[PDB]
């Protein structure tokens, strides 16, 4: 090990670290967003707190939240095409990102 | 020789939907897009099928879904599958056109 | 894998708890202490997050509670479980509040 | 064994004995405060002499007074918070001290 | 049972509720 490799394995662990925290921060935001969704466009009895009452995991609470504004928003044509069948009951992830993104769309549009 | 006649299947499938993006395109955007002139300024016919989608997508599809499902503002580099998600979502929205 | 995802599940977890924190925070004590002026002069998100807790211990839970369960005065350095017992103390003083 | 050996020995075996003697201190001093909050703040049938007729160890009475007054004081709420639990019968020990001393704040700003 | 099981479960037992009420009108 010389001074290269220290200073290569240095900069990879520092650069590392950072990538860490750049995704802690993407975490939050995400957490805000679905925040002031649920809060703005979805019922109160889809809160976090009821729901965790209920005994959900947080990540299921994301996820049935964003499957419940894609129905409220996005119409079922669109749902049928883009993530090709009707049903959102199994399509949570990046297909469910895009959804929610066209959510997003729908309600800047529909304002 | 059954490999060839599945060759053939496909070749039928992408000429057919060569064919339609064609037809829809021509009474959609404009004469200037026409497969001889686009041949003749010297594209190939992938090529001219991909400028025209992309066109397509710049006329029905909305701007944000472009920024948003795509990601990207710009449909200059975006084809693949998500080419493929813009051009259904234009096929709705001139359906519902 | 399942080793990433149940340490996702913890940074989910503490992302959680960092947005409580923060949005309660925000509404208590003050601007001059949000994410962003506090990364600006230089701070790590994990001593950005101690030092919200301990100036909410410093609002909430009195001070002789500090010297008695905690053992000293100035929170500057008490950093840990007491310092989860000092916050859970301040939540309880926030709600009866 | 040389001479710096024979003076370490023998500054260890004074500094054990000094600290023996702060420790007999601090227990005495630990005796008078329980005698003195049974006396003030709980009533006479929690007496040392009753409870010692009982059959009742010396720490067996201080950690029952130590509990009666958490209860007394001390609201349920910051018991389930700091104990973690509402029961205080197997909480003897260094929570029953963060306990005994949030206790004695009450008791302070009560006046 | 997930969330939209429990939705739709209280959806129909609000329903047959107001349906039973219609019914007593």
Redesign the interface.
């Known amino acids: 090990l010389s001074i290269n490799e220290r200073i290569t394995k240095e900069l990879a662990e520092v650069e590392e670290r950072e990538r860490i925290?750049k995704?802690?921060?993407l975490?939050?935001e995400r957490?805000?967003e679905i925040d002031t969704l649920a809060k703005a466009h979805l019922s109160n009895?889809?809160n976090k707190e009821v729901?965790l009452a209920?005994g959900?995991t947080?990540?299921?609470i994301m996820q049935?939240q964003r499957?419940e504004l894609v129905r409220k928003f996005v119409p079922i044509?669109?749902i049928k095409?883009?993530a090709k069948v009707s049903d959102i009951?199994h399509i949570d992830g990046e297909i469910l990102e895009?959804l929610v993104?066209?959510a997003?769309?729908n309600i800047?549009?529909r304002k």
Chains 1, 4 share one sequence.
């Open positions: 925290e995704q802690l921060l975490e939050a957490i805000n009895h889809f729901l209920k959900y947080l990540k299921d049935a499957r044509e669109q095409a883009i009951s895009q993104s066209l997003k769309v800047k549009l």
